[model samples]
Target chain A: MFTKRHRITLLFNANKAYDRQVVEGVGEYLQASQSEWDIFIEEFRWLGDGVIADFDDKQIEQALADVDVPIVGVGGSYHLAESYPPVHYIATDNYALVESAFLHLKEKGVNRFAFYGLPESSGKRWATEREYAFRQLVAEEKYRGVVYQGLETAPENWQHAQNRLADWLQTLPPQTGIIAVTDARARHILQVCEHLHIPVPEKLCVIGIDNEELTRYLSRVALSSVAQGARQMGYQAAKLLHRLLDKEEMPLQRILVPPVRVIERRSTDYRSLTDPAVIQAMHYIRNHACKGIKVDQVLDAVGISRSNLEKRFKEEVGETIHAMIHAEKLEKARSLLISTTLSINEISQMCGYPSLQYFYSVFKKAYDTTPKEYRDVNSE
Target chain B: MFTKRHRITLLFNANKAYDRQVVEGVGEYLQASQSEWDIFIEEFRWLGDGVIADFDDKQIEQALADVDVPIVGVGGSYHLAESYPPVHYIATDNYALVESAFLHLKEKGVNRFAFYGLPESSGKRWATEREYAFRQLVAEEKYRGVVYQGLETAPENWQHAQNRLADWLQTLPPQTGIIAVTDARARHILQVCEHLHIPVPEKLCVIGIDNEELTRYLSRVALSSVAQGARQMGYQAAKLLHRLLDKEEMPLQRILVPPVRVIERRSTDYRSLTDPAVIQAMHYIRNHACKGIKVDQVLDAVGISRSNLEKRFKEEVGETIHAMIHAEKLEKARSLLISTTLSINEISQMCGYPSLQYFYSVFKKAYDTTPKEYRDVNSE
Candidate 1:
């Protein structure tokens, strides 16, 4: 019976922390199970040793041939050659993450979008998935967008590639929100922007997925990222493998863990307002909205009459002056509700609401939920 | 024997990928051992939710009290007040990593250094260690360096801190090399530099530890970092715990795995040469050193006579023009030796050395080791 123990192999990159986390989850499950399961892990660098250096398909293939066990893979590019029952897969929900990136930029008043990703010929399924989702999201919103899938192979000269990217980046519309599929790609975009002397988040906002810390801090602009729950995905994949080992029925062929949240950083942390009056109005509202200041205060701050200020604000922001003030107040209230353990009455007062009933009504109108409900749903 | 299984708790932040990888390594060691080991991990975010936010000592104490097992802690702050057989510690070699950061910046001719870190009052031992090492390293080299430990408590206003940091940052000498204990702190330094309109890499070169991907790519300038071998440390800690469980002799008080390597990003990717002619000459040599370019070509590239160029270059770079050219060639050869499977003769020819004997002699003189010996020791 012990000799009949199941052998499982995990193909992943040791250097990639995301992949290692998936293994951690898998290990967590295996440790909890009763079965005598033997596990083997192989490091496979699909894009060679460095992030943007070269591709090594043959090395991956060789490892695949060597592994004669039930396999679970982390990256989207890994697929079984034959229809095998033991083969399982876990990947980040690229569509969901891309959607989050899109909405995040849209909320920041970005109308133009761009995607930085590897070429399709590079065979990165995750990158292509994100690019496709970005395209669809942009199309649904009717925003101007561009995709730069440059270089199918290693460039003859890296500088040549950089210049090409820089030239294309220069033509992007001011305040263009860019979504790179991965943090590495986002870093590349930021570096290109730095070289071209383009102001980040103001001229070209960028976001990425995976939330890798190295790429975020190392970039020319601190990259904002959709936090894909790689640990949970790894845990889930391990559980699935255990079920398969026990001869339990497989629920699905693949499992995708959606992004947990979006971690905002300087790369996409800007309000892209061009009109001087509207900018002044926004600053005034942000400061005074949670301190009980009315639309008249906003008008005063911008040094314009109510009628003229309202007209220009509507034209520039596509929102009424009163709505903007309420939105700012509600936004602060929502944040305090989610992040703090403050009482509803205290939060209402803190958010500049005169009464608890008024705060509830305003919050319900904006979010279709009460402050307590929002806190319960969103708070950790 | 099975009932005698060991229980180990890992105290670390779950959200940090570096911490997760350490757990992964720990998991790997336990799974490989003959004895069945039960592992529990607790998120000890001593500094609130955000990685660099305010420290919470009470919460950490509560978690420590709850963990009644053979404990393997990640951070340096965890201390066993009374004599305890079960408590073990694993951390990065702060001194070594900090030393590497100093040498990296110094090689690029950075004379002025600065450290951005959490305040000593926050009780972050790891940050304090790195900062202390940085100061010692600077002192040992007799270089001008400054330390900025911002905020004793949660700022009533974050912008107040930003403005204060910016003021201090503006006063720093141009082309100062900075060592931030963590990537988050490094990102803060980059933001301050951006707001003050200071040029990155050229004015301020920054290096951080843990090689976090998110902050690196998200910063205004890409951050260079030392790769703390967190996974290895985790593995070693687990191994140590197992030995303790078996009642084996304890070898040391703590286990610290040195950083795997230095990952150079754009933050410290410049040669800080003040002389424009020397800078131009250096660039020319770097670009064409391996392509058989001589000192004459470098002189021509900078439009200067041999005697004048040599004197100025030596004064500015602390090296003769010929030595600089040969050094650049040898640097490429050394990297290729470590990173590639190329033979000595091939490497010599590739590095512009006419004869194998000449390459060997020059390389031996520079490194005090033969090319073959260098490759044997350095090559992975």
Candidate 2:
């Protein structure tokens, strides 16, 4: 079965960035290997082809009847059995991915948990598996998890998904941790939270799978996601395929690669706060500080005295009332400095400063630089 | 020879955004058709499986021997004949895509043209074809086209590519129009230009194929690209596959889909000017105006009299000396307003305005609103 100049056929999609990384890993492994393997790689999309009636099972069977090699399929491994036999498969370990998310959330000291995924007919088996794993992990911890399947609906049913997701999110305990099966689903959850005025990483923290850059910017708060060991999977797949080519006895048929790491973003950056008053104060200051809000208004709304509220706020959040207001204002100013084209006077006024001189003094003291210098250095 | 319910297997990569669009197009056509086609799809990568010697050519031959149905392969259709028979193929129309770029450059009043692509042995057949087509079109128009192949080097050979590209660019005519094979390649060209201190759309205009959003922000200037009709390709592939399944006499074995259109951006936004003095002056103003350089300094650098320079600048660029300097200052101010947290006073000083009141007065006149209002409306 194995000889010099052996031919190997790899079936994977090259158009995917993740798949490309896997291919790179595979390439690295091949370059270092001993055997003179003649590799044949083909790029194809399963879902793209699945919509057309171009071939029959007979035609497919006939096409594969002549090949006698052990094939390694990266994606859609389950479908490979229909056409080829004795196939070796490499896939991301969904269980490990969810377990990683659970542990990350638990590390953030979040008690409440939630899972979001697509519907049954979506053909997202990995997402389903991830949900199951998340729930299992939550159960083992003796903690209940909220499961939201709004993404399972039709693609055009945005309103339905949004409404249902909003309602489900409202029922979760404050500071709940969420694990979306995919980056897209995670974006949907973030969008729903944004629409409902929920503070991310405070009232509701989220983590998704497949760290896509495009999805990272979809929410106001950047999303964190699980980065699978796709490169490692590709490398390992190549290594194993070489073994099988040598007619070596394989230890296992299906290989699961654990996630490499979690890409932490703003969506899951903070730990849960124990004090409800501090949470409410953070929420209030975040919303109204940029609108010329003062510390007195926050005290009046929360119905807490200056001394008591100031002490508790400092103990919980490690900042005072004036510091929080100033920090929020400066934070807005920082975002504006980098994200907007506003002048210093305009930014100071927008951040609720009465005078440009005072805004300049406070801003320079905090950032240790003039506004223009900060913009020059930090503007994206 | 054909039936209503046929099994069609599509070979494409789901990770590629372009391939996904093509699949969508295929699906759309299938949904509207009367026949209930059973579509089977598989995504495979060539590079990944190539590393391992899991299967020989014999094994691959046997794998596809049993398939009796027609197959539509997207990426690596050329390699499919070894295992399958009479395969239908779909690919981007490189000829048409280059033609579109040629016409776009021509429309922008640019005479000189150049093509940028990866080096040879990159296995990029489409890129090679695109360059050939571009050269052919340029020949047809009786104009010489520059061809640059720096991407062909090893993956880590970026600095080499950049240096070679810079050297090659120095030889091109001023304001030469460039067409890259892909968006990523186009971004590289832009980066090289940025690094070399060559002005864009003034000294050089560039356009690439495959409109990717992420690449848009990778360079200082937004890139323009030829967006492929991937969705249309997918739909057409599915439609043709269905007809093939029905034993219909196919008109052609291969179909080429033209690009949708050129997505214009700042890279190719301007018409080339004939006056070198005006171009030089404009360039100088763009570079040094924010540093408080005025009309006199620009005139001195270009070695042109005030009257002569002012007349040509107005005719070519549609702006006077004083007006251009103010415009550059205001433009930088606007960018800072939207992109930074700098206050008005600091932005005013950085933009070279003598005082905050003067910056405010001029800024309001140009934008029709104060900086604060603009930041409020546009801050992300």
Candidate whose DockQ is highest: 2
Docking model 1 quality class: incorrect
Which stretches of model 1 miss by more than 4 angstroms? A1-380, B1-7, B44-68, B77-86, B152-155, B249-252, B275-380
lDDT of 1 by residue, B1-380 (tens): 01233334455555555765676566444323312343444342311111111112335544455443344445543223232223455656778888888888888888888988888778666677777787777885555679988764345676798788888888776678888888767767765654443556755678887776443113424468888787667666666666655666664455657778888865787765666677667655654577676788888766899999999988988899888887878876776576444468867875778899999988988899899988866773
Q: Candidate 2, B317: how far from true, in Å?
A: 52
TM values, all candidates? 0.38, 0.44
**Error in Å for residue B374 of model 1:** 22
Error of 1 at A305 (Å): 97
Q: Pick the candidate with the highest TM-score.
A: 2
Per-residue lDDT, model 2, residue A47, is 18
Task: Give me the TM-scores of chain B across the candidates.
Answer: 0.62, 0.69
Q: For residues B1-380, could you state the per-residue lDDT of candidate 2 as single tens digits?
A: 01123434444445545655665555444323313343433443211111101011233334544455554544322222342223455656778888888898899888788988877667566666787787778885546788888656344674676688889888888878999888777877776665555667777888988876333114545568888877766666665666666678764465667888987765796666668787667656655667667678988877899999999988987878898887877876776676444466767876778889998898899888898888877763
